[PDB]
Amino acid sequence: LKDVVTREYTINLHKRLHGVSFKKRAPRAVKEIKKFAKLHMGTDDVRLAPELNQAIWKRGVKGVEYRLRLRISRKRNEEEDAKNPLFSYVEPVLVASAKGLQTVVVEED
Amino acid sequence: KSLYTNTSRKALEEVSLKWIDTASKFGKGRFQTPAEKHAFMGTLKKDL
Amino acid sequence: ANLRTQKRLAASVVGVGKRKVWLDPNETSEIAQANSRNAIRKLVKNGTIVKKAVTVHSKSRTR
Amino acid sequence: MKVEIDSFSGAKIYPGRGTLFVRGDSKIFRFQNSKSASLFKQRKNPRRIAWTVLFRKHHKKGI
Amino acid sequence: AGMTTIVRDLDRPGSKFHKREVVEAVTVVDTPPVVVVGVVGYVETPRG
Amino acid sequence: SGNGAQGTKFRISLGLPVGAIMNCADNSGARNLYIIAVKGSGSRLNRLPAASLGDMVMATVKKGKPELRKKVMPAIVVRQAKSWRRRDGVFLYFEDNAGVIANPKGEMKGSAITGPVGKECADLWPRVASNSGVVV
RNA sequence: UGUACAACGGGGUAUUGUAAGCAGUAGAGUAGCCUUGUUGUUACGAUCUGCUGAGAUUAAGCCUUUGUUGUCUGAUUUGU
RNA sequence: GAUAACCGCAGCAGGUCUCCAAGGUGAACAGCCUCUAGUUGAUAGAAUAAUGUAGAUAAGGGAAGUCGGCAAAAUAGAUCC
RNA sequence: UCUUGGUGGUAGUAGCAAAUAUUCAAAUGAGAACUUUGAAGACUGAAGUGGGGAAAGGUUCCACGUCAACAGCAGUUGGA
Ligand SMILES: [Mg+2]
Ligand SMILES: [Mg+2]
Ligand SMILES: [Mg+2]
Ligand SMILES: [Mg+2]
Ligand SMILES: [Mg+2]
Ligand SMILES: [Mg+2]
Ligand SMILES: [Mg+2]
Ligand SMILES: [Mg+2]
Ligand SMILES: [Mg+2]
Ligand SMILES: [Mg+2]
Ligand SMILES: [Mg+2]
Ligand SMILES: [Mg+2]
Ligand SMILES: [Mg+2]
Ligand SMILES: [Mg+2]
Ligand SMILES: [Mg+2]
Ligand SMILES: [Mg+2]
Ligand SMILES: [Mg+2]
Ligand SMILES: [Mg+2]
Ligand SMILES: [Mg+2]
Ligand SMILES: [Mg+2]
Ligand SMILES: [Mg+2]
Ligand SMILES: [Mg+2]
Ligand SMILES: [Mg+2]
Ligand SMILES: [Mg+2]
Ligand SMILES: [Mg+2]
């Protein structure tokens, strides 16, 4: 199908960080966004924007939000690309609430 | 099926039930039916 | 590169701690030749190194 | 098969549910759950607990 | 499927709860019909 | 239990082991009853014999009339404070434990019971039912 | 390539206990304006009242789904 | 000038004399949180069996435990009586 | 239970679990959990994990180059 694509997603980090140790909720939230992008966009190389790492770690190591709202964009890996020719860049989306939002396809236009 | 005939008066007791609990086992549920929940609580804010 | 000596120099030049010296990441190439203290001062002139203002301890709730 | 009424919250008690309390003056109390039960032992007035049946008659909610 | 509780009268003459109600845990087993798809014949041998 | 009890009892949760001090609910002069042993107790290693409502115990008196003190006497538990289950699914309990001084056959030493009596106790012991007022 | 599965979303169920914001002639009162009410006014005021059994959370090993968006052939080995 | 520059076989949780000393809470140079300054060093990742170690909670009873209340709990500040 | 030296099994085992804690991106590089910079989260919390000194050490200070050995993982880093 189409390779370069951009969709926006909601991730329930509450059910992914359920019961995790408090010194590792926000470390694991980073590793669950990468697992979530690899499930959706199919690509093993996931690069998270530093503004998203600010959003995960906003309320400390154990204060991860229940729902993030993510703009994952599958892209073309360049400059002697890795084992996969594609990567996904994961963006925060500035919303007042991450509740009640579905998966939409963001067009580049 | 039982492997032996049992005539022990705890068997052979013809059982007619009077009520069966259908409250939510997902909590300390209080209503047998959703009609009973809507009758006790009245109308809520939830849309129509 | 290795800008560890360019942050200790810049802290002693602008006179604050190394926690309050912002080196320009996008100008990491030209910071790396600033081995002398005058070269550090030159990078403070043009904003390549920024003093990084103080973290607020507000006294408003105390008042 | 008689449905009892909670002595604190006014909820309906189906068989097996909750605890029955005999106070030392032999007045029988009946709880549907441990939320009615614990707030009874905590010396809480049902007229001030906003979800109880007695609060809603005191505040004329759902008449 | 899970358990629930019931109420029934007790028909046990000489018990103290005779003709009174009891509250009993039951287990509920969800049993659709089973499709018969074969037969197997077993012979009695000296080894079983 | 043992002899004296009229009828049998369903199994009630054992609330009162040996060493438990329970209030004394009759007008004999005893203010409490310290359970030294329980009649009808099964022999199990390390298991304290544990009294329950309607059971007959052997007890001393630690507070009360001096002529009742320093002696072992039978007593019958009338209130429990440990939540037990009835056969109709009712879980119930009292605010306190209570017992009345008995003889070995189940006659009351006292003549009046101050407070509620478990219906399992009143049914098992006719003299306790005779002197009880409200029954649960 | 399905009465498929997943991620979200919806409903149910459940827990807590009535969100934020706005409003009030509720508020112990206090300090001013007085062209001095008498259900004045300006300021400040714990709390209270209405919207509001609300709001939040709900599977992470809850249930259900006609929604939305995706996924669906990589590798190795085995023969009487 | 020491959780890596000293002594302890060594980059050892040990030991080794002293100066300066911000805001709040509070009686306090206590505990707890912050400013300046400093560090973010200590093999990591995944999973969440048993038995541990460290921390908890426990219905009813309340020392029946044990050589022995060992450990834990309980008490706790201040004002007045 | 000789002496000196060498070597095994145990065994890729026990273990590398005190001192709250790391995370994202870029740069450098053959190679980055560990380096550098930025961002973020945190801590010591002024009887400090902060600035100096005494004894002791002796060049460990600082720069450039470098990574065979040493830093009980790693290492482009280093009191090497
Ligand atoms: Mg857990
Ligand atoms: Mg349940
Ligand atoms: Mg309200
Ligand atoms: Mg409000
Ligand atoms: Mg020596
Ligand atoms: Mg070392
Ligand atoms: Mg202070
Ligand atoms: Mg003060
Ligand atoms: Mg540690
Ligand atoms: Mg206990
Ligand atoms: Mg207790
Ligand atoms: Mg003893
Ligand atoms: Mg003993
Ligand atoms: Mg002790
Ligand atoms: Mg005093
Ligand atoms: Mg030798
Ligand atoms: Mg060897
Ligand atoms: Mg090992
Ligand atoms: Mg480990
Ligand atoms: Mg601390
Ligand atoms: Mg702190
Ligand atoms: Mg160097
Ligand atoms: Mg090494
Ligand atoms: Mg190496
Ligand atoms: Mg050096």
Please tell me about this protein's structure.
The structure is cut from a larger assembly and holds one copy of chain A (109 residues), two copies of chain B (48 residues), one copy of chain C (63 residues), one copy of chain D (63 residues) and one copy of chain F (136 residues). Helix content of chain B is 17%, strand content 8%. Chain B has one helix spanning 34-41, and one strand at residues 17-20. Helices cover 38% and strands 6% of the residues of chain C. A two-stranded antiparallel sheet of chain C has the order 1-2. In chain C, helix 1 (4-14) crosses helix 3. The longest helix of chain C has 11 residues, at 4-14. Chain C is elongated and about 50 Å long. The N and C termini of chain D lie far apart (28 Å). The relative contact order of chain D is 0.22. Chain F has 136 residues and is mainly beta. Chains in contact: B-D, B-E, D-E, D-F, E-F. Strand 3 of chain D pairs parallel with strand 8 of chain F, so a sheet runs across the interface. The structure holds three RNA strands.
Helix-strand blueprint:
The structure is cut from a larger assembly and holds 1 copy of chain A (109 residues), 2 copies of chain B (48 residues), 1 copy of chain C (63 residues), 1 copy of chain D (63 residues) and 1 copy of chain F (136 residues).
Chain B (H helix, E strand, L loop, with lengths): L16 E4 L13 H8 L7
Chain C lengths: L3 H11 L7 E2 L4 H4 L5 H9 L3 E2 L13
Antiparallel strand pairs in C: 1-2
Helix pairs in contact in C: 1-3
Chain D lengths: L3 E2 L6 E2 L5 E4 L5 E3 L3 H8 L11 H6 L5
Antiparallel strand pairs in D: 1-2, 3-4
Chain A binds 3 RNA strands through strand 1, helix 1, helix 2, helix 3 and strand 5.
Give the DSSP E fraction of chain F (strand runs of 2 or more residues).
25-35%
* Small ligands present: magnesium ion
Q: Provide the gyration radius of chain A in Å.
A: 14 Å
Q: What multimeric state do the chains show?
A: part of a larger assembly
Record field, number of beta strands of chain F: 9
Structural class by sheet pairing and helices of chain A: alpha+beta
- Listing every helix as H and every strand as E from the N terminus to the C terminus, the arrangement of chain F reads EEEEEEEEEHH
What is the beta-strand fraction of chain A? 25-35%
Major beta sheet summary of chain F: 5 strands, mixed, barrel
* Count of runs of 4 or more consecutive helical residues of chain A: 3
Termini of chain A, distance in Å?
Answer: 19 Å
Q: End-to-end distance of chain F, in Å?
A: 20 Å
Shape of chain F: globular
Protein name (chain B): Large ribosomal subunit protein uL3
Family (chain B): Belongs to the universal ribosomal protein uL3 family.
Subcellular location (chain B): Cytoplasm
Protein name (chain D): Large ribosomal subunit protein eL24A
How is this structure best summarized?
This is part of a larger assembly, with one copy of chain A (109 residues), two copies of chain B (48 residues), one copy of chain C (63 residues), one copy of chain D (63 residues) and one copy of chain F (136 residues). Chain A has 109 residues and is α+β, with helices and mostly antiparallel strands.
